[PDB]
Design a binder for these strands. Structure first.
Lengths: 460, 118, 101, 200, 102, 51, 50
DNA sequence: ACTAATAGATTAGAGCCGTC
RNA sequence: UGACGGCUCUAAUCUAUU
């Protein structure tokens, strides 16, 4: 077990620290933006949720343990950008129209119409109205998500209305045509103080997490405004990451029909994605395999100027000869390409005999030059608490095809543990190219009528 | 319910928790008998709870007070409970055939750690 | 409970009147606090005068003079008393005594 | 005269002062606080006088429900009232009201008259007004550099929060198999074992 | 040209006479907004790249081709890029609209 | 034949506000004719034009 | 000695009774016991020096 | 023909919790 | 879907033998 050092993430004025929460709270984001225009919709009551607690976000929200839960000074103090009660294009969604829409007994059409009720209001607003909305903000009530969701279940206490399936992915996918980033909130993500959902205790959240709960809420609502909070430095140039996860497209027919949403992270600090191909087993046929690389790898030609020297394509699935051989002659010539499969295949857990806390994260157990493990989850020296409360498991990282120094490989996956622009955590337990390709894989499969270029994260 | 001063099965509110292991033999990286750690719950200490969601919920709330030591002593004691005579444990393939397997989990060495800052 | 009538003044400039005031004032019965013959000596002057003004003071009787208006120490008493006067919502909390002719 | 002395409760205003000082160090100022130095001890008292009477140019005092009526803060504030006097600098003590529970009518006499810098509603505008006030008063300062705050962050607030070269032994969940049976025998039972015998 | 003009209207500029052609104190002093050389999204369309499409003589086809060079970048940056732009400034040279005019 | 219409009409699917500019309207100072007197005399308008 | 019966601390506030480590050591010990003895009239720094 | 296979060793969904 | 964990539960498939 040689220890892999914890990586670094940059912040304002080119500085380099190690914590996303701590660095922003003290240093700030890299790019300088002035203000954020918050196009906000939702029910009339929900307006009294977002509006006041939005003012709490630039107030100092304290943490009981500044070590484990880092500081949060505000919003203008941390992000150097202004957020205020202006631009609030409150498209009042009456509960009576939702009432005749929410209680429908259908599975998809209940979500299809209810999403459409939210969609047609925001769409016209960015078409006709006079706000420069950057982060669209759709506050969704509680009863809708409790009823309208995957395998939707509705009890029979107040039955009045009668007749993918997910609310979130259908919402995001439709806006790819309209090209608007949007933030969606559910339950008491904001109104946890006075919710007392089950009983008096706020079962959703707590004051301890509130210090960095508003970190995740703010950082999710900050990156979509064209900002660049933190960017990597230890990732070298000329290296292409293709984090791809095969996603089942249908739930009823053709179980072997699937599509892959291959992310493509650049060397110039671009968390770019790419559209893969629909490959019908569990493999990308050369018809689709050639198209992926010839398109995803092509972006280096105009984004930088030349093809990357190394191409680290990531996956949770092993390859076979047909996919890999297609990946050679389609485009990559004189440029290295390596297929790395990262998965929690077999549980190898390590336990510390002397002492009580769990294994520190960053441990790599060699098995071969082309296979090892990576403890990207576990104890953190800085926050003095393990990222995973339970005993963690490593990422079985083996080089399926190609030859590369796996120790050089291992610290590179660890490098992609902090580009997690959906939460404020010290490190994410998966590479960003593989973690963020699951949601976009879920977005691009919500509908079958999208022509998506290599779109960035903020719409997903 | 103790093996070498190690409690393997105990109490949690009204649900009695039991430490359990799942063994999958692998020839990779080297011939090993890979063990997994699980917690399973019995209403009266003899019949498992026939509810996967409840068992999942109970296991999530039973490991709440379990740290690395609580996991390892329970695992090693249960594994050492399967030890045959002194330092191994045989798997019988025939009237004369046996497969001795070590009772002590493989040790690994690391040169970087934290200072245990309480 | 605010029953001590705290009277503000500057230096020994007034002190010969303020005990003359007190020996009639505490002579007649008013609980009078002064920074000369009633100040706790050997302890904080700054913390004590605030402690009586913020909590123990019932009436603020500042003396006006050419030497009891521009001094920072005296001006310190008026602002905190005024803030306490705001808390008490009584304009007549501060009663200037025009002692100097 | 470059130090910006911060007076506050030791364990309570740490969150703000750690923010404020490291912002002040981040903005380039030099700040004394009881949490910006290690190997302390005799440094407390008998050197605070030297760092205040000869090095502290501005006294940014933290006003809060915890800093109010505290032996350390009041004593340091009483010094600030005196240290303001020998030099001709009336704008040497600058209060900072942070706690919401501390009303503006419960402010101590040493800073009642002094125009405080508001932080309760928002820490950002208070930090900005801190910057403009120093620029207007020509407060001595160097170039802005947040690496000093990071250095003060990693050296002080990350001192015993790093990795150390230490040999450890970790237990796992793998039980290595010691030896195997000598021969794997394929028993050639041509139509001798039953076809559907379920050999399991 | 923008690197000259864009920050030129931040500072006040006086014309010949302010009674008939009034001056303005500047963008920050008048319009109360920040609009400077920051967030610039310089996307160079090289003259050889433009010339390789401008050299076509069929105005029924060339004029559509010239716009097609511009929009494809704009929507790409709108969708498949990270940078945010509020108002896009297509600085078409006088030669582009000299020939592609009715 | 003027690309003004097609350029802006093709962004209706994208709905991005593009301010069409020109070198002459933005580079009055460095643009000079053959005789030495520029055709567009935008100097005096550089007030309410910049407005 | 200080914890037992130090009573008051009437210090000679001379021009040279402040930089000395010994008088401060008594003062520093006095400072700790002052909170330990929860007293406020503990120190009486007699200003003798003209 | 592959009709059934009972294991290898991968492979997503996907609800459920715990609180970094 | 603020989220990151952890496991837990299902299903499918490639690879050889009734």
């Amino acid at each position: 077990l040689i220890y892999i050092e914890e990586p670094k993430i940059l912040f304002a004025h080119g500085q380099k620290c190690t914590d996303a929460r701590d660095g922003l709270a003290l240093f700030g984001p890299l790019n300088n933006l002035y203000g954020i225009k918050s196009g906000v919709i939702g029910t009339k009551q929900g307006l009294k949720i977002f509006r006041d607690y939005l003012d709490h976000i630039q107030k100092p929200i304290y943490n009981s343990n500044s070590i484990t839960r880092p500081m949060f000074p505000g919003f203008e103090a941390v992000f150097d950008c202004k957020w205020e009660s202006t631009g609030i294009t409150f498209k009042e969604v009456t509960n009576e129209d939702i009432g005749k829409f929410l209680y429908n007994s259908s599975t998809h059409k209940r979500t299809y119409d209810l999403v459409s009720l939210f969609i047609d209001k925001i769409i016209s607003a960015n078409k006709n109205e006079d706000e420069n909305v950057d982060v669209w903000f759709v506050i969704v009530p509680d009863e809708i998500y409790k009823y309208c969701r995957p395998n939707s279940v509705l009890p029979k206490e107040m039955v009045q209305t009668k007749a993918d399936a997910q609310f979130h992915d259908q919402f995001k996918a439709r806006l790819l045509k309209h090209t608007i980033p949007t933030q969606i909130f559910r339950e008491s993500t904001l109104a946890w103080r006075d919710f007392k959902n089950a009983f008096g205790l706020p079962i959703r959240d707590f004051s301890k997490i509130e210090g960095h709960l508003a970190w995740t809420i703010s950082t999710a609502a900050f990156y979509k405004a064209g900002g660049k909070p933190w960017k990597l430095s230890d990732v070298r140039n000329g290296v292409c990451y293709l984090g791809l996860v095969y996603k089942k497209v249908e739930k009823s027919k053709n179980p072997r029909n699937a599509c892959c949403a291959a992310q493509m992270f650049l060397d110039n600090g671009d968390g770019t994605v790419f559209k893969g191909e629909v490959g019908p087993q569990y493999h990308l046929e050369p018809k689709e395999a050639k198209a992926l690389l010839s398109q995803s790898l092509q972006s280096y030609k105009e984004q930088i100027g030349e093809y990357p020297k190394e191409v680290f394509i990531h996956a949770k699935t092993r390859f076979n000869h047909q996919e890999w051989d297609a990946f050679l002659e389609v485009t990559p010539k004189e440029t290295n390409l390596v297929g790395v499969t990262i998965s929690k295949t077999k549980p190898l857990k390590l336990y510390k005999t002397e002492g009580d806390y769990t294994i520190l994260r960053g441990n790599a157990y060699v098995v071969n030059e082309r296979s090892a493990f990576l403890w990207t989850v576990g104890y953190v020296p800085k926050i003095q608490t393990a990222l995973s409360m339970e005993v963690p498991n490593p990422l079985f990282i083996e080089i399926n095809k190609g030859e590369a120094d796996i120790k050089q490989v291992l610290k590179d996956i660890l490098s992609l543990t902090k580009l997690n622009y959906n939460a404020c955590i010290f490190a994410d337990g998966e590479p960003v190219t593989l973690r963020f390709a699951d949601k976009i894989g879920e977005i691009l499969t919500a509908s079958t009528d999208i022509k998506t270029p290599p779109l960035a994260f903020k719409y997903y | 319910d103790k093996f070498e001063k190690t409690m393997l099965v105990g109490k949690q509110k009204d649900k009695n928790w039991h430490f359990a292991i799942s063994g999958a033999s692998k020839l990779y990286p080297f011939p090993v008998l890979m063990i997994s750690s699980h917690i399973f719950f019995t209403a009266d200490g003899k019949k498992l709870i026939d509810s996967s969601s409840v068992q999942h919920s109970s296991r999530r709330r039973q490991g709440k007070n379990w740290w690395n030591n609580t996991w390892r002593t329970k695992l090693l004691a249960f594994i050492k409970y399967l030890s045959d005579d002194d330092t191994s444990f045989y798997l019988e393939m025939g009237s004369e055939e046996k497969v001795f397997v070590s009772n002590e989990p493989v040790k690994f060495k690391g040169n970087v750690s934290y200072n245990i800052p309480e | 409970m605010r029953n001590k009538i705290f009277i503000s003044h500057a230096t020994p400039d007034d002190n010969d009147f303020t005990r003359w005031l007190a020996l009639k004032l505490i002579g007649l019965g008013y609980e009078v606090w002064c920074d000369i013959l009633f100040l706790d000596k050997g302890v904080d002057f700054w913390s004590n005068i605030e402690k009586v003004i913020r909590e123990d003071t019932c009436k603020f009787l500042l003396v006006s003079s050419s030497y009891s208006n521009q001094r920072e120490g005296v001006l310190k008493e008026l602002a905190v008393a005024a803030k306490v006067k705001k808390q008490l919502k009584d304009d007549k909390f501060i009663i200037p005594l025009a002692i100097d002719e | 005269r470059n130090k910006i002395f911060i007076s506050h409760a030791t364990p309570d205003d740490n969150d703000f002062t750690r923010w404020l000082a490291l912002k002040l160090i981040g903005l380039g100022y030099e700040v004394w606080c009881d949490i910006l130095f290690l190997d302390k001890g005799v440094d407390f008292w008998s050197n605070i006088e030297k760092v205040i009477r000869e090095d502290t140019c501005k006294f940014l005092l933290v006003s809060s429900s915890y800093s109010n009526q505290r032996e350390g803060v009041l004593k340091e504030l009483a010094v600030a009232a005196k240290v303001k006097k020998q030099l001709k600098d009336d704008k040497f003590i600058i209060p900072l009201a942070i706690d919401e529970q501390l009303s503006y009518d419960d402010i101590n006499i040493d800073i009642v008259r002094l125009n405080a810098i508001d932080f309760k509603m928002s820490w950002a505008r208070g930090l900005k007004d801190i910057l403009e006030a120093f620029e207007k008063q020509k407060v001595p300062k160097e170039v802005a550099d947040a690496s000093k705050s990071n250095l003060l962050y990693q050296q002080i607030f990350l001192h015993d929060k790093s990795v150390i070269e230490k040999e450890e032994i970790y237990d796992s969940n793998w039980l290595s198999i010691l030896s195997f049976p000598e021969e794997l025998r394929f028993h050639e039972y041509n139509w001798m074992l039953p076809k559907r015998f379920d050999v399991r």
